[PDB]
Amino acid sequence: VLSEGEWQLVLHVWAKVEADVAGHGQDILIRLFKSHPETLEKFDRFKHLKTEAEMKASEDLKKHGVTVLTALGAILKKKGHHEAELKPLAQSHATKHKIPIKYLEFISEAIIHVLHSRHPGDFGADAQGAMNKALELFRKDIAAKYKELGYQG
C-alpha cells in the first residue's frame, strides 16, 4: 500500500508527464520496443515499424502513446482506489491482446527509464521508488484480474 506522501511523489511527476503527454508516450513505446523487441510482436497494428526511425516517424504510434498514458494517468490519479479504471484494461489485455505480466514489467521499466532521461534534475530516488511502488501495485492488481479472467499472464 502507498502512503499519501508516496502518492503525492507519483502525482508530482505525473504533472510533468502532462506537460508533454505525446512525447513521453512516444519515448516510452520506442524504449519498450528497443529494449524488448518481442513486445512489438504483440502489436499487429505496429509491427510494420521495423526500425526505431520508423517508430519515431509514426503519428499512429504517437497517438497510441497518448492513449496508453492517458489510461495510466487516470489509474494513478485514483491512488489505489482504481478498480473501475483498471477493469476494462485488464479485460482487454487479458482476453484480446494477451499481454503477460512480464511485458507489463518491461513497460514499467521503460516508463522509469524515460522519466529519468526526460527529467534529469527532477526524478530522484524517492520519486523513482514511489513510481516503482505505484507501477508494482498496478501490475499486482492487473494480475489479480487476469487470474479471475482465467488468463495465465
Ligand code: HEM
Ligand atoms: C502501462 C501499461 C499499459 C497501459 C496503461 C495500456 C493501455 C492501453 C489502452 C488504453 C489501449 C486501448 C484500449 C484497450 O484495448 O484496452 C491499449 C491497447 C493495446 N495494448 Fe496496451 N497498455 C499497457 C501495456 C501494454 C503492453 C506492455 C502491451 C504489449 C506488449 C500492450 C498491448 C496492447 C495492444 C496490442 C493493444 C491494441 C492496439 C491496437 O491494435 O489498437 N499494452 N493499451
